[PDB]
Write a protein that binds this ligand. Sequence first.
Ligand SMILES: NC(=O)Cn1cc(-c2c(Cl)cnc3[nH]ccc23)nn1
Length: 297
Amino acid sequence: MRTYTFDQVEKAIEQLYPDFTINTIEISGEGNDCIAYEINRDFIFKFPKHSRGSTNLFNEVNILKRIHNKLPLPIPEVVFTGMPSETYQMSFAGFTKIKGVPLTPLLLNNLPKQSQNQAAKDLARFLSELHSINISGFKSNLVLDFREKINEDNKKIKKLLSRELKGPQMKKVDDFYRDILENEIYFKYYPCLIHNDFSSDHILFDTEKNTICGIIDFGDAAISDPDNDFISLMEDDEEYGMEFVSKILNHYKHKDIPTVLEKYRMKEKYWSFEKIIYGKEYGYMDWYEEGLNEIRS
Ligand SMILES: NC(=O)Cn1cc(-c2c(Cl)cnc3[nH]ccc23)nn1
């Protein structure tokens, strides 16, 4: 990863956009992939921290431009884009600012029961449109094959935990990957376009109108399992409940909720193996060691 001073952001924008004079600039957010900057109170500028994040910024731009105006909820519109550099597919990107605050589980549980049922209706129609977007014109660089991901990970995990586990602790790991790779329900899906990061902090809310007014962060959007846009809203602790999500699945006419829960249960256990890979990828020591303990159990 890397980092930028304010002046570095401004000069990168001026370079590529010399007619665009900046007046106000704040740090808006800081994710794992990008730093977001609010510029002139109306634009969010994503700047990547690392090569992996700039191709997520490249893909986000490309996905937003291509789904421009198709969805039933406001999404960012691409207004400014940077350039590919050395190791960076995209140096930066500027989007339109979507108003609203995130629809947090506390925010939601404080809404009237009507507005809660509306929120689930709105998310259903959003995911229902999104998933029915024809995806025959995307490139293979946007498709999430799950199997090969499981397999790349699996090899990663064998080299990382080699100097960390050994035999008995591992063979349980091996039994866990092969158990997944065997199970078709994880792989026998109809791919569609998915948000892939569909969680409470990416759903913008209008506390005056008491309705959802925004979906943001398509940096992980891909062609993949549409059950992914539902499991990321379950989690009880950090997300909504199965109570609210189930209302979403029912407005969506999802015809197999038991395998939504099979997938949820599996991504839950798998999260510890993502911590080891990303923990070791970015540098997050605590994410690595938080992945290890969970394994050893
Ligand atoms: N680090 C990040 O959170 C990157 N990011 C920023 C946004 C975003 C944008 Cl693009 C524009 N208007 C918005 N309004 C509120 C958020 C939001 N979504 N993802």
